[PDB]
Amino acid sequence: KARAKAKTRSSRAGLQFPVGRVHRLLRKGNYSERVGAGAPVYLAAVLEYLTAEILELAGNAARDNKKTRIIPRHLQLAIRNDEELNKLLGRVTIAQGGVLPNIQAVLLPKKTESHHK
């Protein structure tokens, strides 16, 4: 034998998310009888990209509120302000998320609130 030292499939893919855990989760879960090697890499990459997008929007909103730590509020702000993510999660509730600030124009008072004589 030689027993070449094992690197992780993640490290072969240049990714941070795992692979092996995903493969196990696909085997246990009644999705298909057999699973091909390529699938979990693709899936992991998809997850990484989405996660990166979300966090990036969250951190931008964070810098807008002068806080250095991400809290759920920021995630809600990121989600509803991107049309596509809002489409994906249109029927999802984020805990402690609240909603966007939005008042319909019509029920705000008229701008004629000033000198009137």
Add this chain to the structure above:
Amino acid sequence: RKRSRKESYSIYVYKVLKQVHPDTGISSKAMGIMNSFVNDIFERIAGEASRLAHYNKRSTITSREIQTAVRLLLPGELAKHAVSEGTKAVTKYTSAK
């Protein structure tokens, strides 16, 4: 002394966060949110792939099926970019064995 073992996606989310915004942290509740989010998307995609497989009388889930399900579930440009990353990932993995 008895002790269990619950897995999550926490550590990996932390890595990604440090990659995109080094001087920023994240609370436990939000990490839980991200964990549940990952689990939800995983479940949707796998189920959809399964349904496609079963409809075409093919017993193997491949990269192709995942790609298809991604195009079905997600809209537009998000799909295209994510698909790009996936294809790049497969090309790197398949070469450097």
Add this chain to the structure above:
Amino acid sequence: RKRSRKESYSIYVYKVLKQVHPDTGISSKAMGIMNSFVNDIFERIAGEASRLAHYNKRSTITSREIQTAVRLLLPGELAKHAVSEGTKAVTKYTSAK
């Protein structure tokens, strides 16, 4: 001479129809409708059963799980009467082996 084979639930529906209204027929389109209906309900119930099993870390789908799924999906009295029919069927099947 080559020939395929597509299964359906047609004949059983026909039997039931003659049992309930002997002097009555049914067109092909409606039979197709009933076929689709049956397949849809089958899919929902099995899927829900699977999800229940997976959430409780049990790898067997038993009559119990089906009964629970039925109480979840259907409302009120329909569920009660259906559950009764199912229990009666199990009780008859298990005895007369």
Add this chain to the structure above:
Amino acid sequence: RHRKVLRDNIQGITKPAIRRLARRGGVKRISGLIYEETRGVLKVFLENVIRDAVTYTEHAKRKTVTAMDVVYALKRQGRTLYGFGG
């Protein structure tokens, strides 16, 4: 004495709390008949979800309703909830 606090029931969901809730939705002005109807609506929602949750609870032979049951029961109604596991 007769308190039974206001009905020993949903009426503990007090008016100004509903007002605050409507405020979150951007509303400015509310009628006096809204409150009761909203309460009924709330009850129905809760009823359905709780029923499902209890049913999940009944399947595992437990007497404690867990968070997971609430999550799943909400998921089947198309109101998936994040942040409490699942």
Add this chain to the structure above:
Amino acid sequence: VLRDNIQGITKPAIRRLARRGGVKRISGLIYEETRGVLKVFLENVIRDAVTYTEHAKRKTVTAMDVVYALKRQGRTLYGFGG
């Protein structure tokens, strides 16, 4: 002359549909908006349909692709198989 082909969905047919929906009186501006709305729905469905179509490496669109694409948008359809 052909007219982008969306105009094949004519006024009187839309009037008939609205009649089935319990509508008695219709403004003139409805038509354009309705057309647009219709287009959107079709687009989404066919996209998904064609996606299923592309997955089988077939070139012929089948009913089943439409049924599935409809099912996934929460508008399940009965009466054409599956």
Add this chain to the structure above:
Amino acid sequence: VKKPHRYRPGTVALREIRRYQKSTELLIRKLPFQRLVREIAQDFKTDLRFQSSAVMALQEACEAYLVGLFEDTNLCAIHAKRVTIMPKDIQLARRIRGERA
């Protein structure tokens, strides 16, 4: 100063809007909600117990649902050239979503 300072109708409601929209804390108190859940659950099955986080999750779900409903309600109200929501608006919104009852 002689007379009490008095804001015009509407302003304080708007102030409440901005204040509550900027924050995220739950608006309903824990205990009454606990008692409500406990009563309804008792009518289906007896002597049940509830973890605290389950109650919290129900609270979040209910408040989000109600918020969405009032949003659609307010739109329906604006559609009728009014500013006051009324029961028929809520009925309209719920009927359109299919949350019949």
